[model samples]
Target chain A: KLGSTLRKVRNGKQISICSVADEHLSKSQISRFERGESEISCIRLINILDKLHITLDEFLILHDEDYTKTESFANLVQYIRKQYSLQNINNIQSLLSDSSNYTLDPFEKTMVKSILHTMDSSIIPSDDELLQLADYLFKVEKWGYYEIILLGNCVRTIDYNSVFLLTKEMLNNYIYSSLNKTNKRIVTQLAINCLILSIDMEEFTNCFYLIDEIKALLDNELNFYEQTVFLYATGYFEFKRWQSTSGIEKMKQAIQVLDILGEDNLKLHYTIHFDKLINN
Target chain B: KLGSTLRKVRNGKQISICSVADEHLSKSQISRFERGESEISCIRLINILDKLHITLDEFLILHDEDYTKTESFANLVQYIRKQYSLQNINNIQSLLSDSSNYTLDPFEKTMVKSILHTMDSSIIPSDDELLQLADYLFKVEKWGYYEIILLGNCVRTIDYNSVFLLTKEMLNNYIYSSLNKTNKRIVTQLAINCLILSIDMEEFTNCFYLIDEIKALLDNELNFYEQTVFLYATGYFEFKRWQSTSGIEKMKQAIQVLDILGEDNLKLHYTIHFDKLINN
Candidate 1:
């Protein structure tokens, strides 16, 4: 598909195959690649088209049919499913296909199409795809999705309760490993996140242990980076936690961290919002 | 003291007075500066002496007696007392004089001495001095001192109740200013310290506001230097706040921020230490 697209674009530009091959790729190799007798590497294909001054979008149109096939779609579906541990693939597929449930925001739709074209016959997605998925989940405020992507492989099962327990254990282990290796910052942070997730899941006892671990770890010295992130995250989560519980201590801890991090603009905005919320 | 020390060091090196003056100060200016008829700017003095290969400590020792006897020492004492609103100068002085009260940790001592020697004498002290003071107070668990130093001018007149209120307000303002002006990382950091101090003082409500503010300001941002410092400060204060209140939620928040900032190494160390403390 990619080769055909490159050929079409090259043709449109009034460039001959022999001339392009001579200038960009060796003639025999280009002929072999064009005839489907050989595969063109991504770098070479890009370089040839670039040298021919072909637009990527125009090149993409030639291969658009191949990308639209059910097999290609299925591959994409399987990749996401395995990566995110969708408990019910059918349900998620429905959600994705449903315009109402999956309004692909223009940018997301475009990205999906681009990714589909890239996955044509062969080609595993890069790590960037994983990061983007995580980012998308965060933007959608889908904690379930976040858990599935970031902590998916580490967890034993897909149910909410099971995932919760798995995340707790995984985070605890991550923290433990960090500490054992004298990675104070990573340990304290993971422990803190685990504690929060545990609290959100109403596992109060686990939260306590996590908190205790954080306290003990901080007894000695912290380097600059550890101290900053620690304060920033603690303040952030505490504020989130306080909204539901309205706990004075949590609110105070949030404020304290913000102050330490020196994020007054945010503080003022929150003050106004909180005040509005309370008054309303 | 600094000027004399520079002179002595330069003399000891057998560098001609004219050459030293030419390097650090103009010939006329150096003569006038030495005669106490004029003062060289801090930057100029530092540059000149730096060129002469004289350490700041050596420069300070030239007029050690003068520094000890000068009105600046008394002013510094009075300034600290006024800034913190301490009625008992003797008590605060006692705190400063007491070897046990001030942990002479090498880093802490170096920070203090460096600030004392290098800060612009005209200003109360540099932001670095304030940060160092906050650091020292944090290390010793001296919440009161931290509060005083952070609140600055208001500490004297602000009652304990007002101290909490004023510190939060001041910190909020400082944080906003720091964020709006990108170069204010150090000041923003100091503001974070103030928030920690506020948390220690039991200003829970205010602490929450500040934390949210900081988190909002820092979300998705990537400044390695600023983030590193902020992370360490956050961890330090969160740990301290946890110690004082046994706040599980605060611990979790700290961890989350660390993760987001990709400071897993720091978090790891905190986690191990935390585990050890509980196990011990």
Candidate 2:
């Protein structure tokens, strides 16, 4: 576990194990650990981590099995979600287009396909993609909390029924009621996404009913990022409906929190466009 | 999946397929469905469930693998937990004495050994048993809320350092931080047990530091069971230290809750013994 984490972090930094190694450890030792050929002592592991400029706690966290899969895809989502501001849509979009260039697994391929189809300006994807995502998520995690992200993507897929039903199934999952603060925020955010989509379909009545559930999960004190995420979505929803005055207030609040956190300001920066759009 | 659920419910009640079957479903059809050879239609499934006096939702809930495994053992725990009139220990005590009369799988067996050794009147089971339990839990869940229960059972084994380390590890498990309410209650209650055990060993100061973490998991809003559990453990911990006044107050609150929730009130019932012991 530690070895795989080390490799991801080392590779993420674009540094080689030979460079990370010094008098404290040998190149072969790092390589063997990365290959899962052997183990490393804590002191040696700390040395490698110091070279990578990461902490021991962060190393253990990134060591999770879900990290690598989630990390690559998470970055892809962030880049694309800016309305393809990176302008490398042509490259990443290949994985979702007619032919695949990236070596994504079937799950990743389907996920990319799901998100890309949602993003494409001209055309919409079938409900079938949400079906595959739901089934895959069900088999893997049995209506897991992380399904919230996939469901958010589905709201953009024009398959409102599948998104609605899948959300219901997830809420019905025996474990749903007991999620921790972080997961409740994610799940609640998905509900907000569904609510946003519902306004377009003129199903605002149903969306109103869903907001109560969202409010319940919102009670816990959320991390600044998560709180800002909730703020951004609600603000975007209101702004899209032309509620600029109230919506911009929410956006301003979100940006304030985001600014204090000082991590990623991309979301805060992107959301400010609401005021710009209103002025235009 | 439906077939197994149907079969387990049917077997649990000692009901027959022929009894559950009628003209719309022939004997062979019901038998095949119960045998996992055939699927049942929803209309017929609903009819069969109606005859069984269970809801569609209830049937689906019992269908989960972990739900069934957890429910069965949980009931068994309640039955044996009476330091009460069931101190007719002569009955449930059979499995603990001379032992191995009944068969349990490796997991169940390890769990049983872990708990039983904790309860043995004089013999304080070896630390090795606790090690095995921790290793098995580590393999099974790595770090888990459920493992806290197993760790609670190992308090009597001379392995405080290992217990402390494993508890911290499980608390570190990525999933542990995000468990649903019922599980958080279970995990937090077990932490209280560890705290109670620690006080006897004068490890009380460490336990004191550990509790803020537990209270965070406790949260302000808890269900009846969770609220009652926290009060019960705190009461027990205080009563052990001869802080009877505050101890009795917490116990009084726990019993009042148990009365409302209407679970096996035996814990509440048995705890009145504290009041009796004090007055005498």
Candidate 3:
């Protein structure tokens, strides 16, 4: 248990042993200390704890086997687990509202509040019930709402890899009629949103991989608006990481494309901000 | 002048005539309209202007030439050019402060305010200034500050290409003594800062590239605090993007490293929040 705790704290903080090795305590000595085979002096103990950034009192306190068993902690753990599981908070409020039917202990309420406080508000779902609603939307053909919720959730939460995996899997199973006019728009929109979220999450390599997917969707001559937005999104990513002076030129091209389409709106405002930064 | 103005507006707005062909006016027609070879009907002109999100009055009023006639505007332009030439804001401020005989005009003050507003607050130098500083630092054997400021500026501005270029150049110079002993602490701190900033800016590929530079500097020895901080930053990026479950494991490793180093003042807080919406 001691070794495990030490390991947990170390990994949580990202410290290495040689960093603290002194004249008396060598790297190997510190290694032995962590293995629990060697005894350490009080001064060394304090130093180690100091490096770990943990209080001695907290380090000395040992909990029961079920210490995380308190209702509040468990609920908090579950909330974190679900965020990891779902890769977003698409309908968290509805999920919580439905959960309200169950008699939540004080601990559980505390956990819920703690988790709520840590969330990014912009993409929070209207209610917890929307979690199921999102699954339902995915099942039916109401992809517009589904995509928005999914993208919103992905943005708010941090598990972008799972979202990308799920999206890729869904694309494989779903097929649309070429004649269905809206199919193109739906697929393209999903692709763009995924690209944006991925880029924002610092997944530039993944964003690069999705460029082909976007290109394939646009092969069928899209409407002017669709084409413009698609080109703009592509150009925006092309400028990701401020790669080169060439990126500035690419952004210029994107603005030119948008101009041709004449679809100036809120989207255009954001794009203009990005362009101004690049120009400067 | 008209052609240049139209091109500037088009590039700034990310628009193209082809996109507006059907939505506003035909591409060929708009081209002719811009070139002054054909007269556009008032209705068509209004439609085109509306599509571009520029009012007819704003579009018609030219500000480009006014800068040439107005003394204040011309002074502002000259000031920007001169400041850009000096390459560092600190140097510019120092020079300005020392010149007791001179005072800044209203336009010059506005220009300075605008430039400063666009710059990142944390970093001492702007991106453009960093580029200039890098040139001087390299010539003067001041690689330590040069590397730190250049790398930090790259991350702050999301300029991966610049980071890559600068790092590659620094590596080629092959000077290790400048970062020896106590100065090594500064090197590690700056490197870690660069790594964290790069990750935040979504420069993942650049992050990978920078890791090699950092490792090269580390050689066989690792500073407990620096390594831990580096690992924590890396783990945060990985976890946030769902790149790997190993991130948590890595965090644990960092904590252990810190423990061995016997430095325990840093605290790790684990907080996750979930927010969702429910559809009726």
Candidate 4:
């Protein structure tokens, strides 16, 4: 219970043990407390919680007296869907990378590995690899959301030519074809990401044709936030054409959309790159 | 002069020719007005400018009545330096893709082609292609920054393996090796981008090592807005490890960073995504 509570506060702050470690205690020690392998002194727990900015009362409420390892990997799945920030594949890679060090159920290992592999950008995974892991996951597990998140990662890493086929398949899937507004917003981002990658590859005519063919899918499909990506991408295309006026204009529109959506980094990105048709 | 002025106001608002056009005018009509190929009646110019939200006095100051094409592709070099949004490789690609339709300077044509080819994610440019472009841009024209942007895009499309070598060489170069915060922030983003691609390859060990080594590069080097990307990336990394508590925390930090930066889109992204961790 103590370990779980320490872990919760520590993880709640998204800080590493090293960040909250003190002269009196090492990170490994904190890790042990977190894993619940060792009991911690009250003073030490209080110190750690103090660093996490948790007061005693809050910690009392947060640290359950009836703690029974209520935590499960269900929360993990939600994290995966929400973040979909695949660049951190190494985080899971560390866990699933070496099976010898960390044991796991066979199905969970495959799902984890499949997610990482599907999200991998550089080395092309074998068709066999995807087929094998996917067959096992689909036939055995019956995890609807798992495969959704898994395939979503696959499209997230859409730098491949082959992935476009998968992209079309997913777009056609009944599950993805119809979604609530929120999920639609999420999935459209991946589509927009895939579209941007296509643009990065200079597949404009084909993509524009695809986007045109699916204008209903493209139009109003994006929330204000996702629209920034779409707008910035098109603005970027215009700017590159040496049509500075129009390009700058497109970017300003993107800025407005971003203004509405509130993705500042892109706004910074847009600000940095958006130039007057004539700078001098 | 009329063309330049009309183009100025029309682009200032970033509307498409078709978007701002109506039954009174065609998209091509607006396009022609922008290219300064023809004159517009005073009534028509006012109509267009007014639709663009430009007052006549403001338009007069901006119109550049004495305008010459003082701006040619001379500004292109600057824009290229600032934004290698080379996904617009096709913007110039159309210029070269149908070279028969549009004539360009021989050197400009080579550069535009080379840039598109290098930036292409799936298609690999030959070593000879890279060598010739580098030689022409470097030894002959001393186009250091141009090559930098070109190769930056080269690695930006690092879905291919060979780009890793090119990525390393530039990172080691004196010019890039010694960068101030702003340029480092930009270059680090590409490095961060490159590292993300490295993750896409599933080389967990080397890529993680690379990301860890450059973690400092990701930290403090960026402004509040840019920091949103950094925070979000780290937050995603945490969540992937089955470290939901900390992952949620990191994501919250990202939200706060984005909130501070005034990027509502990302803040919205953070808010929508932040709950899956703690919520039942």
Top DockQ prediction, candidate number: 2
Give per-residue CA lDDT, model 3, range B16-119, as digits (tens). 97765675457887787567565454346545644544433234333232233222322333455466545556533432354623354432332343344344
Reference-based TM-score of each model: 0.26, 0.38, 0.26, 0.30
Lowest lDDT block of 10, candidate 3 chain B: B271-280
True-vs-predicted CA distance for residue A88, candidate 3, Å: 24
For each candidate in the order shown, give its overall lDDT on alpha carbons. 0.44, 0.55, 0.48, 0.51
- In model 2, the runs with Cα more than 4 Å from the true position are A1-111, A118-151, A159-186, A198-207, A217-228, A232-247, B6-33, B36-142, B148-280
Instruction: Name the candidate, 2 or 3, with the larger TM-score value.
Output: 2
* Model 4 per-residue lDDT tens digits across residues A1-280: 4577667666645678999898967888888878977656544665676565443334543453336312223345544443455456656566555543444344445556656665664434456655554444333211123334455555533235655544554454413212113233444655666666665566766467435434446553323345455666665655554556765666676676454334566677667656442362
Candidate 3 local accuracy as lDDT? 0.48
Q: Per-residue lDDT of A1-280 in model 3, one digit per residue for the tens? A: 2444555456544567776666756888667756866645434554675554343333433211223323222243445556645656543343356554333433233334334534644433343433443343344321222233243334334246655655554454333322122434455666767887776676887787777777766653323334445555665676666655665555555455333323355348758667576676
The local lDDT score (0 to 100) that residue B184 gets in candidate 1 is 32
Native interface contacts kept by each candidate, as a fraction: 0.00, 0.01, 0.00, 0.00
Question: Tens digit of lDDT per residue, candidate 1, span B1-280?
Answer: 2445455555654566677655545888776665556666544664565455432223443344245533222234334435345344343333335563433333333333333332233323344544554443233311122233334432322244544455444434331211112213333444555555555566656566656655555554433334444454455456545653434343444555445444576568656644653466
Task: Report the TM-score of candidate 4, chain A only.
Answer: 0.49
Give the number of colliding residue pairs in candidate 2: 2
- lDDT (tens digit, per residue) of candidate 4 on B1-280: 3657566545544567777777666788678767866545444554665455443333443443345323323244444433344356545556655553445454445555555655664444455655554444333211123334555555543234555555554454412211012234445555555655665464545455555645655443323344455455555555554556765666676676455334566578668766654463
List DockQ, one per candidate, in order.
Answer: 0.01, 0.02, 0.01, 0.01
lDDT of 2 by residue, B1-280 (tens): 3677677777754678889888767888778877878766544675686565444434544564434432333334444454323444344546555563443444444555555544555544455655666666554334333345556556556377666666656555523312233345556656666665665566656565556666666554323344445556667666766677887777666654444223344455546655674676
What ranking emerges by TM-score with the best candidate at the front?
A: 2, 4, 3, 1
DockQ of 3: 0.01
